[model samples]
Target: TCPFYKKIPGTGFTVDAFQYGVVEGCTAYFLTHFHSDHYAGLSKHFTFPVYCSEITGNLLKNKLHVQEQYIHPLPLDTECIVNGVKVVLLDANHCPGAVMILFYLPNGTVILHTGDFRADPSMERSLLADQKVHMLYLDTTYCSPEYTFPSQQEVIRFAINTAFEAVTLNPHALVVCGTYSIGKEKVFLAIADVLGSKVGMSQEKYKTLQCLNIPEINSLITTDMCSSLVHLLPMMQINFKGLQSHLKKCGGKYNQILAFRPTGWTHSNKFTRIADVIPQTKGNISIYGIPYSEHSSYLEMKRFVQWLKPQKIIPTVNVGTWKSRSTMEKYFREWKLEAGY
Candidate 1:
């Protein structure tokens, strides 16, 4: 889901609106992260001042081939003045280079734009406490009660253990974990380390991940497919049919296949325990849909809403439908009151 509006109401800047063309009042463009949905409109032909985290800026340069002159990479936890507005970047905890932007207008109004963020416990409370934010542009991706799921660490632990046990039983089993271009590194990396497995990926994909310069994953990645039993590939490629073709290429080096499909869509309120999530199996192939979401869960969103207590909130996602936006906003109002705002 994407935001309905790109322009930040009172500012001359637009956040994640490159696809909509130039807005009349827009003076600067801000990218929240490198996800295709957010940075959909950006192209080599574009000529505009862009602001984002350093990691995202590199991705813009290397992946999209955006010119260096227009890209402005900002540091986290520091205030920078952009055309008279004071801006601060905080970690979004969603993807690499993703940030939660804080803006202070000259008119004494404060706005917080959480660009596709997951509200984790490690977030700095002092940065948001008593800030008197007037408007909060939130990432309402999983803002419904039914979308509640376990924490990232818990899911990761489950994934690591599951992968370990599966491969242990079937020593020749090939392990596959699905991921996006930027996020979900923790899940696979944790599993790889725990099982002492080398991660396999396309050379191009490995190059993309190397831009982040993460020490933990750099030495563990390899372009050779058969060298490692665990391969990290696009989420769509982890299916039964996809794996069957992949297993065929291995030339019988692996007898069975175990796949981890991580996404929030797999979670259900009806499930009593996180481990109760059943795996889909047909023949020697099994695919486990892990509720390993990178977005804030319903309860996590409530905690963030209560913590910030912004005067008003504008849902940045799931706003295409009126009913969805209205439903999310209704919860916002309740959470605001619970915060004594």
Candidate 2:
């Protein structure tokens, strides 16, 4: 429920426990990815050795300026001994550097910590395919049943189609996408590819993109504002006021603004269906809040839990209250029963 619970039982290891102070009996720290929420308390001040994926290790060193002497980057799919416990990293599919860590304890128990993942069918062929995971530390960001949005591919198609239609209607339209530091790159990348438009973004975001090493993304992105009609901006700047300012700064080169704001919360607080979700327009700005999420949907989580069939389940997020904890447990029990375990 708290950061204290992140410390794996029967071991002196903690996964994504930086926000809390130094944990008692902590031998080493394990970072799943470079997400700010996961590595919040990590800094040069900490003295413990950190274990993470190679890309995440690079981000920690370059972005946070964490000392390289303390970082230990592990190779994916290859098991390595860390303080006598076997550790392996698997692609989480949440972000570029994100990973789902697997720990084979000395006592023969196996624990899988999904930092934050979007479940895909390819994971069935992952290293955990033939192994039994005793405990599963899951990312319950969309644990509730109401968050059954469409798959990532489907959402990306919708976004491309929507933009294509808008730009076809108005050839001089500028496409703007809202994004975080990482994640959601696939959506905009697909849009730019389909529309044949160059992508523009701030220097900070462009630097993070370079760290990802996504193929052909560097050639598509430009720092010059005048070079690209498709701009990737912060999620906070997708609003009308922000769009107006951005539009004015363009010096009237474009006729209208078509912004795509992607998030899982697109269907918050009751919704008819994904078909009913539409773009909101005020004057020259039309913002489309697409249901494109990096986290697993309700059905995706159910499918993952049934396929994995772990002995015990733990909710990593939204465990602040006993009430919420019990609710997630109820779902887990139902899933376990259906999994015939």
Candidate 3:
């Protein structure tokens, strides 16, 4: 028995027309995060009043370039009423703009929708206040017993170590890694911080960094009038010709280069082949296997579900295929000692 609408036959829940319609009757909408999957379809179909954290709203407007309309922005932990339902935003720890939403109804039924989240105790403690929740919408992206992931800090350390090793091996070498432009700017900052005054950021990167309020890293640049040791450049705008020209003109005369970009390599086999064609004079190029995912691991998912103790759990976000959902349902049914959603 879901609260908003009538239950469908097989899925056990009715679709909220308001979620995808302009004049649908649903009273409120909760945006758990600003990720493309969660927020992309929002402006196209649904124009109803929406609720989210202040940071998330800013991210939508600033990062994703979304226009603000009837968005009701609230700080974390503060409860607000939209339409007729009580909504609260909890930190998701998946990204800076991420949030987990709690919906409370007048009948005392509560629903917890955890938009992708991690179980880092520090992150969990900050977002979840140890309060008991009734039902939880879990993130089952890696909800298998065998799946494991290293901590974010550990992954960062590994990436940095790999970059340093690459640069040391080849003075004239160029290293290109991948990351999201705005979503994971912290990694770039970390790299700049380590490189100290030796790093230089390109104009576009500097602009992006400025918007993110990482001016300290921006101030340490050494291009034109700018004078920093490490070079932080935008991976998107840099063509091969542009890269070669910039390298030739730059004065620091370091033979090695290290760069980071998003995970576009996995989607393209050609990119992997091109990376292997590093200049022979430059040292050997190594593709580091450091993982920096923001999603939760299997143990984290299990613990969250156990804590929430939801009567029915709905899978969203990375639910994937029906077979996958069935497998997750089976695993949780055994571990939770409770029935499936």
Candidate 4:
């Protein structure tokens, strides 16, 4: 929703562009995920029918209170013809219902819109394998070498083990796992699964997770801080001034707290010598930032682009990544200049 959003040339299809604060004119609209930044402008008054995953469709109706019939559910790995364009959806591997769009246009041009995701080689099993892409609407959030980070699986393992180790180091310390309100529930569940305990959450967060209808997670939510030693906290919780203190909040209580941000931003140059988890002493509590990102690193982006061999790369994020010819030539120097695939 940041950039590179437009109706496909010679076609009327447009997607993930609702951030304009209103659904603009286009042939059809598709939602990639339920992220606030992606669906910022969606509302109950919206007149258009939006296509999205089953889970996302339900979420839009019950959670956001959009009109029921206006939200259409599209199954993953299935092709649907809309406006004479054959469109397919594949797992984006970012959020619970995130999807990567594969457009088989009438002009015989195939375009792939990689909704914010970590590139997985297993994606080759999809219908897009061994196929040439005409254009790639890329998630260039980390389209720089400096942003390279570990895979999410490895990062989850790092979080589970590291969080437990932190608990061991400080027996009375409360381990707070910071994550996005909607996504990253997997990480929270992973930590809880390994520790064999319930994860605490605020009433609002618990309600949010309840809408997901996930058995493994929905039952695990409790407002009592003492119900579990580990608490699933919102990302913004870490910024609270009392976060470092062991004071008791309305729903949580802790002492000698240890906070671990299960996120990819740890790769920042600010922490050079830091490895998987960057730990720092903040007042009385300890904080750690993990290198778990949903987007591909520059290195991974290179591999994905070279594999697809797209005719052109249109970055959806970060202007500097492809803002200049020199920049494109520098990071993507080895890319083949195919006029049309």
lDDT of 1 by residue, 31-83 (tens): 99999988988988889899999999999998899999999999998879998
Q: Using Cα atoms with residue i matched to residue i, what is each candidate's TM-score against the true structure?
A: 0.95, 0.94, 0.72, 0.87
Tens digits of lDDT, candidate 2, 1-341: 23655888877889988876877788988998888888989887777999998888878887788898999998899989999888889999888889998989888999999999998888999899968999999999888887777767778878888888888899889999998767888888888878887688888888787777677766777788787878998999999999999988989899799998887765452555555666788998899888777899888889998999998888899989998899999999988887798
- Residue pairs with backbone overlap in model 2: none
Tell me which of candidates 2 and 3 scores higher on TM-score: 2
Report how far residue 183 has shifted in candidate 1, in Å.
0.9
Off by over 4 Å in 4: 1-4, 21-25, 213-215, 244-246, 250-254, 266-278, 320-326, 337-341
- The CA lDDT at 45 in model 2 is 76
TM-score quality measure for candidate 1:
0.95
What overall lDDT goes with each candidate model?
0.84, 0.85, 0.56, 0.72
Off by over 4 Å in 1: 1-4, 124-126, 267-269
lDDT score of residue 252 within candidate 4: 44
- Provide the lDDT at 191 for model 2: 87
Q: For residue 311, what is the lDDT in candidate 2?
A: 86
Total colliding residue pairs, candidate 4:
0
Better of 1 and 3 by TM-score: 1
